[PDB]
Design a protein around this ligand. Structure first.
Ligand SMILES: CCN(CC[C@H](N)C(=O)O)C[C@H]1O[C@@H](n2cnc3c(N)ncnc32)[C@H](O)[C@@H]1O
Ligand SMILES: [Mg+2]
Ligand SMILES: [Mg+2]
Lengths: 276, 271
């Protein structure tokens, strides 16, 4: 019977909270939080007292049923995360789905979002964009993920940690090339806030100039691929290379052209250039 | 020497304004908005006076003012500014001119709708307003039919029925769609259901299509198992050339299909 509230929290600047959020927090009986201690400190700063429930992804589903039962009893539950808004790389998906399928009102509240905040000042097209969150921590997985989105024409939003910023930048340089334009937004809404846009190679070089520039939390905005059709499809080239490894060059090119339905002369020229 | 500020505005709830935004508005001596009337009404409700600037080149004037040393705050009618509209060129020019841009967190209709829709969020794409023309809308839907990420669109009450019919025609009926209406207000309503069921539900009453809407559509992540004729012909061609096992592996890696299936199919054909 009681409604669930998705109340965002500041992303580092306490002053960046909404009045409605404070009223809702003081008007609810239980607050599901990623880390009770953290939220507890935030509540104390505003002089708000309420019950805290440890709700994180590890025990999300397990306690989703308990939260649903509590809501059915007429209680009001507000969901908060350490920062930004829940459900965006933060726990809450299973609980929200269970509440929705059980016929429970869900009241979302506007609030801070690191990706949106970075995009607003990114200086890049915002009409269409794709959010991807964190990148794989492994080199092979990261390279595969980057390759899969190499041809994406929309602006790309990624989340990044100081622990792997240099490796991720190097992988981006290797895959997407240094010509791509990338914007790094660090410590938004904080004293050391800094947004720097540049070619990937230039960006990397600038970051390596000082360790201070890769400290804290970061968001990466990658300009989408340009609308150039001169380059032939990469899948055809990969198939041609694999068939060359397994079969003779001429048969490999003929089979690749036949399956992909592309001109054989261009594929043969590319293969000859690669071999040379 | 001046600093540009991005100050998101409420989206239909005056209580959704943050303290930092109010302090920034007081601090800046010139506020630039697209719709002067809306921002003026917001300021009067908050009892704020300032030198409003109207947007319609204005980029050069704003850059000159910023270079002079005047703090300018950029605002929009609702939500976060410079989203689904031009203006990012000005931010890029200011960054290239040594100016410092301070974004402020604020309301976002798409993010707010996504946080409550319950559809997957680990990865999503925002497509903004769909084409107002039926042919354009159908072409856009076709271009994103195979997208596996959750899609977020903005729609107006005028074309909500047309958009729903277009999605029904293109994406079919089995697809799950969530409609968010009048978020952050007494009329807020989020309803999730198949496209056809949602269309019937919205047609059942007129108030359900009143205002501005946010549409969240789950990506295509089902019925991906099949045996395309291209894979079969490739396997047949490679079998005569390479050993069955090698041909099956090559076909599987080319078409991204299970190798063991192709092998069983080849054996059944041979049999
Ligand atoms: C792009 C122009 N945009 C401004 C929102 C801002 N740009 C933002 O990013 O949040 C206007 C569009 O956003 C949607 N919208 C705004 N407020 C809404 C609300 N309370 N409920 C539902 N939808 C809403 C709706 O589709 C409207 O036509
Ligand atoms: Mg922790
Ligand atoms: Mg968290």
């Amino acid at each position: 019977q009681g409604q669930l509230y998705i109340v965002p929290t500041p992303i580092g600047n306490l002053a960046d909270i909404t009045q409605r959020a404070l009223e809702v927090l003081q008007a609810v009986d239980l607050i599901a939080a990623e880390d009770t201690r953290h939220t507890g400190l935030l509540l104390q700063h505003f002089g708000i007292n309420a019950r805290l429930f440890a709700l994180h992804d590890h025990n999300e589903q397990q306690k989703a049923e308990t939260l649903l039962a509590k809501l059915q009893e007429g209680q009001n539950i507000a969901l908060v995360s350490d920062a930004g808004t829940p459900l965006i790389n933060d726990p809450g998906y299973h609980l929200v789905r269970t509440c929705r399928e059980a016929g429970i009102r869900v009241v979302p509240l506007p609030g801070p979002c690191a990706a949106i905040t970075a995009l607003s000042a990114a200086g890049l097209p915002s009409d269409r964009f794709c959010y991807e969150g964190f990148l794989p921590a492994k080199s092979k997985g990261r390279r595969d993920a980057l390759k899969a989105i190499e041809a994406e024409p929309r602006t790309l939003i990624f989340y990044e940690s100081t622990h792997r910023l240099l490796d991720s930048l190097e992988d981006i340089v290797a895959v997407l090339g240094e010509s791509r334009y990338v914007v790094l937004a660090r410590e938004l809404t904080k004293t050391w806030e800094t947004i720097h846009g540049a070619p990937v190679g230039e960006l990397l070089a600038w970051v390596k100039e000082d360790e201070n520039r890769r400290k804290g939390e970061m968001v990466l905005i990658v300009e989408g691929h340009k609308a150039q059709e001169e380059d032939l499809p990469a899948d055809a080239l990969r198939t041609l290379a694999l068939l060359q490894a397994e079969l003779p060059l001429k048969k490999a090119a003929a089979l690749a052209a036949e399956i992909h339905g592309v001109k054989k002369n261009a594929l043969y020229k590319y293969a000859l250039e690669q071999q040379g």
